[PDB]
Amino acid sequence: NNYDGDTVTFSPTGRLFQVEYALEAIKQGSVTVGLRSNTHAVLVALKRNADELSSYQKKIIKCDEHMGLSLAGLAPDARVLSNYLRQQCNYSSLVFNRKLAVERAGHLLCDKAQKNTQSYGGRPYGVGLLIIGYDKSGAHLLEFQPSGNVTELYGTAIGARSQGAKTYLERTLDTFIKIDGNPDELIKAGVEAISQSLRDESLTVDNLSIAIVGKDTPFTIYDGEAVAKYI
Amino acid sequence: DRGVSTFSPEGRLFQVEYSLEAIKLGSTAIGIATKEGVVLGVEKRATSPLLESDSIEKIVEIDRHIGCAMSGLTADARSMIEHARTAAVTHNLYYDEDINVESLTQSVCDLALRFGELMSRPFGVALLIAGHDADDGYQLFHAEPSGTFYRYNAKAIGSGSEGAQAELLNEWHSSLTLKEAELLVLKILKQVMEEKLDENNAQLSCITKQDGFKIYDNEKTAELIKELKEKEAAE
Amino acid sequence: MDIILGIRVQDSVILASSKAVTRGISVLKDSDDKTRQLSPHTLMSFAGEAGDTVQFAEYIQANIQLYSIREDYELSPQAVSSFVRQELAKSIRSRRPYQVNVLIGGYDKKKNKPELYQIDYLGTKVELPYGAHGYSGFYTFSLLDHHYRPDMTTEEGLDLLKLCVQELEKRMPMDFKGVIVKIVDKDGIRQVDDF
Amino acid sequence: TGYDLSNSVFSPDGRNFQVEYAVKAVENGTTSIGIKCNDGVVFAVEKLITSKLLVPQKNVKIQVVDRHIGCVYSGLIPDGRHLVNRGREEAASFKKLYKTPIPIPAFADRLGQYVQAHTLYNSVRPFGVSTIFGGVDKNGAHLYMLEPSGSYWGYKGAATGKGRQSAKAELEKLVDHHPEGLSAREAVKQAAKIIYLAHEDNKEKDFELEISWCSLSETNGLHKFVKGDLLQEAIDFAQKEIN
Amino acid sequence: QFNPYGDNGGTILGIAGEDFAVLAGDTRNITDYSINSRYEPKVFDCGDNIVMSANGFAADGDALVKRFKNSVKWYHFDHNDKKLSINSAARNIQHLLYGKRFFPYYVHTII
Amino acid sequence: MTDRYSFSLTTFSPSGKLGQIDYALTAVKQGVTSLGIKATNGVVIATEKKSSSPLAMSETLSKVSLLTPDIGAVYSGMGPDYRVLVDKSRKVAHTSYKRIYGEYPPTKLLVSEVAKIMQEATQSGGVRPFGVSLLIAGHDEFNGFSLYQVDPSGSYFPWKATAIGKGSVAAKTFLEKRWNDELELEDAIHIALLTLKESVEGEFNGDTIELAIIGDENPDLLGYTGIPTDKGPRFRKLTSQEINDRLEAL
Amino acid sequence: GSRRYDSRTTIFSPEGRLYQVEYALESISHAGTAIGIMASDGIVLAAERKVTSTLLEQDTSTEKLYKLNDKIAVAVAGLTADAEILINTARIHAQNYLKTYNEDIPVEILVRRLSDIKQGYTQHGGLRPFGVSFIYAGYDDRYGYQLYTSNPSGNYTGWKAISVGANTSAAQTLLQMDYKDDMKVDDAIELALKTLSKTTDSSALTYDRLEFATIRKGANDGEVYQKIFKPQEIKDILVKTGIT
Amino acid sequence: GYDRHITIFSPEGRLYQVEYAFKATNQTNINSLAVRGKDCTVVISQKKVPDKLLDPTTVSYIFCISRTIGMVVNGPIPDARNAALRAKAEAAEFRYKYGYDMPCDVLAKRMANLSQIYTQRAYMRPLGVILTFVSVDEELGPSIYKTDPAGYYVGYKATATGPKQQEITTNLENHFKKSKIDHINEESWEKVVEFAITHMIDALGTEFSKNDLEVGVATKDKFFTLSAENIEERLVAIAEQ
Amino acid sequence: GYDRALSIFSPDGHIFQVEYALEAVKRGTCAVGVKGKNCVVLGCERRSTLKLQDTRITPSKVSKIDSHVVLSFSGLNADSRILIEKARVEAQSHRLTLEDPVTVEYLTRYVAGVQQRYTQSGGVRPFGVSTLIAGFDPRDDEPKLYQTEPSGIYSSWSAQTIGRNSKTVREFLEKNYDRKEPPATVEECVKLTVRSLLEVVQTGAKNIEITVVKPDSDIVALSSEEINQYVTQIEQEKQE
Ligand SMILES: [Cl-]
């Protein structure tokens, strides 16, 4: 109310409204899902168009050969943050000949988002990210919130109506975590997960976006006729 | 007052949303993409009859393979065009090749959110970027001050946009010829414009693989206007 | 570069400047004009380091032209010479100093008098009845000490100048390919085409 | 009024309301504690299990600074990470110039001055965390608690978060019943009990327990996480006491 | 006075056919009259069917190959995974080299 | 972080007033009375030493300060503001004058530099004006003795005699009746003590009054001999005992 | 942040005026009147001191009239402290020109630069403008005798006769009435004193409330002399015209 | 009314932020006192440790700034420690630059100057603290100098600070009216400490255990704080008379 | 450095500081540009509430940017000096690098760019100035007239006016200027310009300034009598 003019102000109950308003931009975003087994990690994203004459806004971005993310909210902010991750992954490779641990990637995003919540003039990032990767400790899934909070999960979803997929994955937990050495089945589970968040619209060929990374699979994105297999 | 980079309670940036209102006050610009080329057309809208209309420059070349149309606070577009041209030429210097249309558009959109307390405010102008490259063929992009860009088969921006866009939804198909697209831009511009459309208050342009980006003469557009009026009377 | 001369007579300043541009064992050009007009009644000739000369000349020209447009007025030859001196005096303690020697010939319209200033790259300014830069002075000064009179006409000045060029063409080691001669008086700056 | 709209402004009381508002953010966070013992310190924290989908043991909250200091905090988690990052920078520069690892009181003032600095200007926000931290140096064991204002003291036991009062009461009993001192292994068990007892004030979601310790005899003066057999033993001790 | 350059010896060779190209190099690495390694490869696959060698001062050679490999990576990131053609690679390498015009990479480069 | 206050805090109001300067002068009005009188062969500056507690040692707090050997200053208003102004004033007499000309600045020019410093606190970003009015007394070879007033705005005026602060209105009127252009330094000291008694309420002695003169050169206060041209400071602070001697023949 | 306390000194009103400039002019309208009159053989500067006290040292005083170089002087209306900042800049600028070109600075060039500095404080930097209006009186060999005025906006104009500060409206009407082009310096001296005498807010105009200066070619042959009047000389010139 | 939020003048020529910083001074509800002997300067302050979980040895408002200078603070501990670190750094630099130990009064002036800046510059708040500096200066002898958020400072014969400062002040005034001298006419610092505690007891009307007090003593060439047992030894001596 | 974003968007999509800068232009004295078949004429109003002016030394309303291009303006006088100075410096810089004087379009494009920059830079307000820029390109005889405004937009005009009551004089020019036949001579162009100002001015005495620019750096300012003859002639044809 009187305490939402900037990020540098606390409300009387200890809230940061600018950070909460940034969180709200994610809620308006199109639904995206993340889930993993012990061998692979999978992103599924519902893409959004302006109208029938426009393209469908790309939701998934590659960060390295072993890492990448999906976005929900302000897309330019995802571009800034993904670019930062690309550099951090890159620095680790050039300087230490070391693939950046998905966990460190989370810590680095947390600290970059945090600085924008304590200084005058700045604003919080207005985007949520789901980071998947395969590193020296196996497959991983992370959830980034622009409050700075990063969380490691077996599965999750962010965006509008994400609660449907998040409930489904919570039920399916014991099944999909043991889909080891089978990419097409882990994707099927993720495609069924994102279907619990659809209303009046169904998954089409220029609507669905799937990404996968794992033991013997570089981070690769599927669009167009390559996702027809899964509808 | 309040910070320039402040979020609204609905999760949107005040200044970005307000600049979108400035663009709705701008003159209409329409683009249509075909397999034979991309057409760009704009309403000139002279504020007075004494103003020499050919000095109104709302369609602009970025490179031989990329052109651009604008709507809103058009003075804001000068540095955007300057950046676009430098980005295009610089990429050719570094890589001995043409820069992809999408890469150009992404570069222009990188300027957009570089405001705050960097420039003092967002741009008050939207851009239609049209071009050709070997990988993805003929392309049309709508670049906004939000930093977001969508690829379009056809798109209208400015005061007559929502009416013109609804018209473009009905008319566009994946088999339109370049000539069919030219006439369609003229037809839809004539519909949404205030004053009566002629060769002096509207301008056409296209980009083709073979001949690159070309702004049409007033003589060439006048004949397309005459061809359009004759075809509408012919049924 | 190489030869630049100047003679102030009763009513005008005459500047003579060599036409050759030599690099290595090749004379690359024999029609080079080593001069810039700073204002309607002020002319500057220059000699020195390659690149530096024209760059400095044109920089001074731009500044005097800027002043002219701002004030709708022409600076006196004395004022222009002092501006040029200061620029060179700054330059001599820079990271890379301008290695340029200049002569400034002007007609002061307020005084109705010709004026000739000799300024070297260090910023050493002197007003003179006659001037030279480089090795040229070693022949011309003594010659002019003998034949020069303060009341000479423009025609007498040109004959006096012919005598200098002749001496230089006889005793100087290098072929400087003749001179371009220009006259500064009450009516401005004009070039003698047949010298 | 309006005295509460800007950091570093004194109210007519002589208070900085923005700091007091940051304290509200800390009171909203989960419970964390510190127990000082014979030759070291023990840290424990409550991790609310929001969903089945959280990977157990894999969202670690206790943080190490240098090799001998442990830090835990309640409130805005990102703010706590910022403070630890600074703590690590401070400790590195102390070890660089002076060779010896940073003493705990020295480290405490480094964090204190840094947090205090964020109450001096209106262009920064106070920290939304209270931080419990400590370790072992050349003078033995030290436990500290640092608040948003920059205020810190040495503690026999410390608690912050939603269950701070419950935990404080439980801590005071240990101080009264053990005047001679508590052993490191005992303090680990007690930490588990206190977190379980402090969980009553946050009992909708069930939780995951996380413990760490520094002890001159048990961990050789270095910070280590309590895992496996020692953790399950501590969990069981706690489960027996609530029933 | 410290000399920032050295000479690691070796030699390289590139030949082009109608539908193929070879890039060869010996595997010996030296300083002065000593052998550092009998097998230290200096011909590398840089992705997008481009092979590269920068022969002379190995520290500069490795630095350049490292920077170009990284350049290929970012070309994909910035231009929708587009393949970097050999002519575009060549132009890019010119700028990598000329950027250190007044403190040169002490190498002969072949791709 | 960093000073984000790069804008003026003193601005013009619709009526034309500069609010913060006016309010600074109001602070000066609340301040304890100080005065200056110019004689033919010297200048006297005086003020009351308002003690904050009887446990405080008022000798450790000097209201009258030496700026150069021939220039002294006193004030009315905010003490802390005055103290830092004296530091700055002493330094600027060196940096912008003595280090250039090898001699101390004349009174009018040192006054001019202090006025500049106070003017800048009226226009620069993120600062309030100084809450003090200064009275600066001094001597220099080519101008003789002089007395100046510097206000929060940065304005300065030369005075034959004047007062500033609490009871300045009454004190100025008292000085107008007593001042003539033939006053000898001792006559000016006498009038200074008389004028101050009107504004002082409690104890009136050499421990509650601070008083200094600009008069003859004091060779005994130089600290060295052997240079004929160096003859000693003209600034001298009267001792507590020297004040009481004059309070008997009052 | 600090946005809260920003007055925004360099913005437009809805009517297209600059608030701070307008308010600075309002401040200047309460300052003592200063008059400049340009004659064919010289220039007069006359200014009224702000309500004097009898114990003010009148001879060693300067408040209104300042020397910029040997050929240019200024009359001040507004905050004196603000004026001295600008006067020192102007003095340095004059010397820079003399050092560069070996000729004394033409009056307009000096006036333009000082006016340009004022302009800057109204467009950028977020600082309050200088609350000062100047009357420039000077001579150069291009235009001869010249009077200019500048104000807080940074706008400057040339005059035959002009007033700044208090009661300019009444002062200008009086000057417009009795001024003619063939006027001499001694006539201009009289007009200046007569105008101040009629527009003054005081009871009667006396020597101790005035500063006076002339810029004549009344030296010896083709050169210009600046005469800042001493107290006694103002007392005499006030008697000579029969005001006292 | 933004003139109450930053350090600019109010219409009546006041600085409210400075005034409110003075009120922050009493936020700890602790009273301090300083007196001078012949050879020493003693400072005492109340020690209130309410929480049983606190380590009492770490609760302190007396600081050793240098070997010769001690400082007691009245005000919140974060601001108190901010002032102490700066004072330590300033005193260390002075010694390096000028070749001799920083006098108590000079450090006081310097810290007072820093405080003055925060009353004039907008981006910096005043510190809500009052700093009492004590030493036995090699030139001036036993010294007490005190700083506040206004940037004011002065030397004292003796002084007191805190919520109940006026009671202690008048108590001390009345003693020095009687004794007719500027100090405590005592040989040992032990008895000057005893005098200090005695006159604090009388003025506050409370009894102290060994853990209710905090004592700093400055002698020639060193300032030191007393342990609980040093104070207990001192409390026993007062009781047995 | 002072950073405040002074020019920002409002909810309706307007930048008020730019729009208020236009109000300052509307307050300024009227300026008019008319281009003929072989010339451009710049006319300027001078308000007459200022008697006792010295017109020798007072800043003229039309400024030479180079020997071939001129600039007049409406709005804040102090602001215009900054634009004129920058334009004059760019004029000399262009001659230095391109070895050719500026085109009128280029000089205008530069001036407009400067104005635009002051609408999205922190810590600055927009220029309270609109300009008329007229002249002839090097080695060209086609007349050029351009107009700029605070927002940064610029365009070419056959004839245009700015300043107070400019809407009245624009009305006059809109019915009195034939695009098919521009004023064929200098005399015709000066007259149409003087006529248009007389719709708004008052007395045709020392209230109107006229400057004529012809090809190849041929610029001259008319004197009082020369202008007064146009005023006298127009009034006698009017009484009909
Ligand atoms: Cl200091």
Task: Set out the domains of chain C in order of their start, with CATH numbers.
Answer: 1-195 (3.60.20.10)
Closest CA to B131 of B62, B182, B199, B53: B62
Closest CA to D144 of D133, D136, D135, D159: D133
Contacts of F9 in chain I (CB under 8 A): none
CATH architecture for residues I1-240: 4-Layer Sandwich (3.60)
Q: How far is it, in rounded angstroms, from Cα H183 to Cα H72?
A: 20
The answer to whether B155 and A54 are in contact (CB under 8 A) is yes
Classify burial at B173, counting beta carbons within 10 Å of its beta carbon; exposed 0-12, middle 13-18, buried 19 or more: exposed
Torsions phi, psi of D240, nearest 5?
-70, -30
The answer to whether B23 and B72 are in contact (CB under 8 A) is yes
- Give the containing element (helix H, strand E) for F15: none
Contacts of E70 in chain A (CB under 8 A): 90, 94
DSSP B75-144: GGHHHHHHHHHHHHHHHHHHHSSPPPHHHHHHHHHHHHT-B---BSS--SEEEEEEEEETTTEEEEEEE-
The answer to whether G207 and G179 are in contact (CB under 8 A) is no
Q: Verify whether the Cβ–Cβ distance G142 to C83 is below 8 Å.
A: no
Rounded to a whole number, what is the distance in Å from the CA of G16 to chain B's nearest CA?
20
Q: Could you tell me the two tokens for D161?
A: 């978060």
Q: Report the DSSP pairing between strands A208-214 and A155-158.
A: unpaired
Q: Verify whether the Cβ–Cβ distance B165 to A23 is below 8 Å.
A: no
Q: Look at residue F145 and give its three-state secondary structure.
A: strand
Q: Distances in Å between the alpha carbon of A227 and those of A33, A44, A224, A230, B208?
A: 15, 11, 6, 6, 32
Q: Could you tell me the two tokens for F242?
A: 């020297």
Contacts of F2 in chain I (CB under 8 A): none
Say how far residue C183 (Cα) sits from the centre of its chain. 11
Q: How far is it, in rounded angstroms, from Cα D102 to Cα D92?
A: 8
Is the minimum CB–CB distance between G149 and chain I shorter than 8 Å? no
The answer to whether I6 and I124 are in contact (CB under 8 A) is yes
Looking at chain F from residue 2 to 31, which residues have their Cβ under 8 Å from any Cβ of chain A?
A: 4
Which domains occur in chain H, in start order?
1-241 (3.60.20.10)
> Vertex C18, ends C15 and C21: CA angle to 5°?
140
Q: Distances in Å between the alpha carbon of B220 and those of B199, B205, B207, B208?
A: 9, 10, 16, 17
Q: Could you tell me the two tokens for C119?
A: 């300024």
Q: How far is it, in rounded angstroms, from Cα I18 to Cα I184?
A: 38
Q: Verify whether the Cβ–Cβ distance H23 to D12 is below 8 Å.
A: yes
Residue type, I148: T
Residue type, I126: P
| Helix locations, H25-150, DSSP H | 77-98, 104-120
The answer to whether G192 and G35 are in contact (CB under 8 A) is yes
Q: In what order do the strands lie in the sheet with D129-137?
A: D63-65, D69-75, D129-137, D140-146, D152-154
Distance F89 CA to ligand 1 centre (A): 13
Q: Which residues, including other chains, have CB under 8 Å from residue F105's CB and lie 6 or more apart?
A: F68, F93, F96, F97, F98, F113, F140
Looking at chain H from residue 114 to 143, which residues have their Cβ under 8 Å from any Cβ of chain G?
A: 122-123
Closest CA to F139 of F109, F107, F108, F111: F107
For residue D17, the enclosing domain spans: 1-243
Q: How far is it, in rounded angstroms, from Cα C157 to Cα C5?
A: 12
**By CA distance, what is A221's nearest residue in E?**
E81
DSSP state of I107: H
Q: Could you tell me the two tokens for F190?
A: 């006498």
Is the minimum CB–CB distance between E77 and chain A shorter than 8 Å? yes
Closest CA to D127 of D77, D92, D177, D89: D77
Strand partners, F34: F47, F164
| Category of C70 on φ-ψ map: left (φ > 0), alpha (ψ -120 to 50) or beta | alpha
Q: How far is it, in rounded angstroms, from Cα H36 to Cα H17?
A: 33
Q: Could you tell me the two tokens for A180?
A: 């080891």
Torsions phi, psi of E102, nearest 5?
-100, 15
Fold for domain G1-244?
Glutamine Phosphoribosylpyrophosphate, subunit 1, domain 1 (3.60.20)
**By CA distance, what is I111's nearest residue in B?**
B75
Q: Look at residue H126 and give its three-state secondary structure.
A: coil
Q: How far is it, in rounded angstroms, from Cα G64 to Cα G228?
A: 11
The technique is X-ray
Say how far residue D242 (Cα) sits from the centre of its chain. 23
Q: Could you tell me the two tokens for E110?
A: 């072949």
Taking residue B158's Cβ as centre, other Cβ atoms within 10 Å add up to: 25
Looking at chain C from residue 35 to 94, which residues have their Cβ under 8 Å from any Cβ of chain I?
A: 58-59, 62-63, 65-66, 69-70, 72
Which of B2, B4, B5, B7 is the best mutation test for A, with the most CBs of A within 10 A?
Answer: B7
CA dihedral (G69, G75, G79, G80) in degrees, to 10, reads 50
Torsions phi, psi of F132, nearest 5?
-145, 150
Is the minimum CB–CB distance between A119 and chain F shorter than 8 Å? yes
Q: Which residues, including other chains, have CB under 8 Å from residue G88's CB and lie 6 or more apart?
A: none
The answer to whether C16 and C180 are in contact (CB under 8 A) is yes
Q: Could you tell me the two tokens for D104?
A: 């705990």
Give exposure, G206-235, as e/b (b: 16+ Cβ within 10 Å).
Answer: ebebbbbbbbbbeeeeeebebbebeeeebb
Contacts of D58 in chain A (CB under 8 A): 152
DSSP state of B13: B
Classify burial at E17, counting beta carbons within 10 Å of its beta carbon; exposed 0-12, middle 13-18, buried 19 or more: exposed
Q: In what order do the strands lie in the sheet with F56-57?
A: F56-57, H153-156, H141-147, H130-137, H70-74, H62-64
**By CA distance, what is H8's nearest residue in G?**
G5
Q: How far is it, in rounded angstroms, from Cα G49 to Cα H184?
A: 60
Looking at chain A from residue 72 to 111, which residues have their Cβ under 8 Å from any Cβ of chain B?
A: 73, 75-76, 79
Q: Which residues from F are below 8 Å from G when comparing CB atoms?
A: 4-18, 38, 108, 112, 115-116, 118-119, 122-126, 143, 146-147, 153-162, 172, 175-176, 179
Q: Maximum distance among all alpha carbons in chain E?
A: 50
Q: Verify whether the Cβ–Cβ distance C78 to G103 is below 8 Å.
A: yes
Q: Which residues, including other chains, have CB under 8 Å from residue C10's CB and lie 6 or more apart?
A: C114, C150, C151, C152, C153
Q: How far is it, in rounded angstroms, from Cα H39 to Cα H35?
A: 11
Instruction: Compute the 3-state secondary structure of chain B and give helix, strand, coil in percent, each to the nearest 5.
Output: 40, 25, 35
Of the partner residues G16, G119, G179, the one whose CB lies closest to the CB of residue I52: G179
Q: How far is it, in rounded angstroms, from Cα D81 to Cα C138?
A: 80
| Helix locations, I47-206, DSSP H | 77-98, 104-117, 166-176, 186-198
Distance F1 CA to ligand 1 centre (A): 23
Is the minimum CB–CB distance between A99 and chain E shorter than 8 Å? no
Q: Which residues, including other chains, have CB under 8 Å from residue F168's CB and lie 6 or more apart?
A: F29, F33, F76, F162
Count how many Cα atoms sit within 13 Å of the Cα of residue C80 in the half-sphere of its side chain: 34
Q: How far is it, in rounded angstroms, from Cα G1 to Cα A9?
A: 9
Q: How far is it, in rounded angstroms, from Cα H19 to Cα H148?
A: 10
Is the minimum CB–CB distance between G2 and chain H shorter than 8 Å? yes
Q: How far is it, in rounded angstroms, from Cα H68 to Cα H224?
A: 9
Taking residue G170's Cβ as centre, other Cβ atoms within 10 Å add up to: 14
Fold for domain B1-235?
Glutamine Phosphoribosylpyrophosphate, subunit 1, domain 1 (3.60.20)
Q: How far is it, in rounded angstroms, from Cα E54 to Cα E63?
A: 9
Is the minimum CB–CB distance between F1 and chain A shorter than 8 Å? yes
Residue type, G56: L
Rounded to a whole number, what is the distance in Å from the CA of B51 to chain I's nearest CA?
4
> Vertex C175, ends C171 and C176: CA angle to 5°?
105
Label each residue of A111-151 as H, E or C: HHHHHCCCECCCCCCCEEEEEEEEECCEEEEEEECCCCCEE
Contacts of G1 in chain B (CB under 8 A): 3
The answer to whether A124 and A117 are in contact (CB under 8 A) is yes
Place of tokens 């970059």: A112
Contacts of B27 in chain I (CB under 8 A): none
CATH class belonging to A1-231: alpha beta
Neighbours of chain I (3+ CB pairs under 8 A): B, C, F, G
Q: Maximum distance among all alpha carbons in chain B?
A: 59
In chain C, the N- to C-terminal Cα span, in Å, equals: 19
> What is the torsional sign of CA H138, H143, H149, H151?
negative
Residues of D tagged active-site:
30
Q: How far is it, in rounded angstroms, from Cα I173 to Cα I161?
A: 9
The answer to whether B151 and A55 are in contact (CB under 8 A) is yes
The answer to whether I75 and I130 are in contact (CB under 8 A) is yes
Distance B86 CA to ligand 1 centre (A): 53
Place of tokens 């964020």: D118
Contacts of H27 in chain D (CB under 8 A): 14-15
Strand partners, E77: none
Q: Look at residue A221 and give its three-state secondary structure.
A: strand
Q: Which residues, including other chains, have CB under 8 Å from residue C26's CB and lie 6 or more apart?
A: none
Distance H114 CA to ligand 1 centre (A): 7
The answer to whether H143 and H159 are in contact (CB under 8 A) is no
Count how many Cα atoms sit within 13 Å of the Cα of residue G233 in the half-sphere of its side chain: 10
> Number of A:E CB contacts under 8 A?
6
Q: Verify whether the Cβ–Cβ distance C69 to I92 is below 8 Å.
A: yes
Which of H14, H17, H22, H53 is the best mutation test for D, with the most CBs of D within 10 A?
Answer: H53
In chain E, the N- to C-terminal Cα span, in Å, equals: 35
The answer to whether A4 and B8 are in contact (CB under 8 A) is no
Residue type, B219: E
Q: Could you tell me the two tokens for F205?
A: 């002695």
Q: Verify whether the Cβ–Cβ distance I9 to B15 is below 8 Å.
A: yes
Taking residue F131's Cβ as centre, other Cβ atoms within 10 Å add up to: 30
Q: Look at residue F92 and give its three-state secondary structure.
A: helix
Protein residues with C-beta less than 5 angstroms from the ion ligand 1: H 113
Place of tokens 């990690």: A41
Q: Verify whether the Cβ–Cβ distance A21 to B11 is below 8 Å.
A: yes
Q: Report the DSSP pairing between strands H130-137 and H141-147.
A: antiparallel
Which domains occur in chain F, in start order?
1-250 (3.60.20.10)
Torsions phi, psi of D111, nearest 5?
-65, -40
Contacts of G3 in chain B (CB under 8 A): 1-3
Q: Look at residue C130 and give its three-state secondary structure.
A: strand
